[PDB]
Design a protein around this ligand. Structure first.
Ligand code: NI
Length: 341
């Protein structure tokens, strides 16, 4: 049954609740972003109103074949009325088209649902600055102090520098980047830009990227693998057997692979700096795991929450175990005592 942390009290609304059938009392289903754990259940047979960003709506129409008449895209940073209730969508700094949702309840309560987000000080100058928020539905994916990772900019500099050095040493090296969902497009786009190449990929992945409103995209990506020296493959194929196999397919054009796996966190993070990251190598194949995250680190999360000063926090991630829940509630209390709210 639909969990309470997916329902918005005082409304007919749910958030990211498409796998429970017809939710009793729901007049409008919101979708924060196009990741499978959140859209699970949507298809061309869905006949209730879905509210989302323009980009999410492009993906629902083209990838899932949801019919147009049920897709209700909203502009960002704009006050809109849905079924009698004021709402605003804000950029969540997650994957393309990902939003946070502000609900202004008829009784005066203000609720922020973060969806999935990577908290940033730029959010402290959005429409959140303009009123008090009482209840926070929080993406707690990395809510423990061990979770440190570098800025996205530090990680992309590492990747660009590594790829440019390798391919300038060996012009017959191929760069491969793993993917299994939208998000993290900067990794492969920044590497292709430094090398003067388009990114090559499957027809299914090309179609997905063509839904994302990325500027100048026709100039950056392609389905002609033979003309490209950056290839995208499924994440599952980023291992020595998979990569050896792909190298065979390229008809002797290449004699080395340098591959990237953009993991979120890996416990190499508690000891090692980005400057110090090294690959796993076998023969003429090297694999780098790079800590590119689209979720808040512990410290980014804590700064956002201590700024916002909500009256009540409802976690949306790691809620299935008592140990996790109790850990998270302890940190919430520390933060509140340290800041004084
Ligand atoms: Ni997500």
């Amino acid at each position: 049954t639909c969990p309470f942390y997916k329902k918005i009290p005082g409304t007919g609304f749910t958030v990211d609740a498409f796998q429970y059938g017809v939710v009793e009392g729901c007049t409008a289903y919101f979708l924060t972003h196009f990741h499978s754990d959140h859209y699970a259940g949507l298809s061309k047979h869905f006949t209730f109103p879905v509210y989302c960003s323009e980009i999410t709506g492009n993906l629902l129409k083209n990838k899932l074949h949801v019919q147009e008449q049920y897709i209700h895209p909203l502009p960002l940073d704009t006050e809109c009325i849905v079924n009698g209730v004021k709402v605003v969508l804000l950029d969540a700094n997650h994957c393309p088209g990902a939003v946070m949702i502000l609900f202004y309840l008829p009784n005066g309560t203000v609720i922020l649902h973060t969806g999935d987000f990577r908290a940033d000080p730029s959010m402290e100058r959005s429409l959140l600055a303009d009123q008090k928020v009482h209840m926070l539905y929080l993406d707690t994916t990395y809510c423990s102090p061990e979770y440190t990772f570098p800025s996205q900019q530090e990680v992309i500099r590492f990747a660009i520098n590594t790829a440019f050095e390798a391919v300038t040493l060996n012009p017959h090296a191929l760069v491969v980047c793993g993917t299994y969902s939208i998000g993290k497009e900067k990794v492969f786009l920044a590497i292709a830009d430094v090398l003067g190449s388009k990114v090559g990929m499957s027809q299914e992945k090309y179609k997905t990227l063509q839904c994302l409103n990325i500027p100048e995209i026709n100039s950056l990506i392609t389905t002609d693998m033979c003309s490209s020296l950056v290839h995208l493959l499924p994440m599952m194929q980023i291992n020595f057997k998979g990569l050896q196999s792909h190298l065979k397919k390229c008809g002797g054009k290449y004699n080395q692979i340098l591959a990237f796996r953009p993991t979120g966190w890996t416990h190499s993070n508690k000891f090692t700096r980005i400057a110090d990251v090294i690959p796993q190598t076998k023969g003429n194949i090297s694999i780098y795991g790079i800590p590119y995250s689209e979720h808040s680190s512990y410290l980014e999360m804590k700064r956002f929450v201590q700024w916002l000063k909500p009256q009540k926090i409802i976690p949306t991630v790691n809620v299935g175990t008592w140990k996790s829940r109790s850990t998270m509630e302890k940190y919430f209390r520390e933060w509140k005592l340290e800041a004084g709210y």
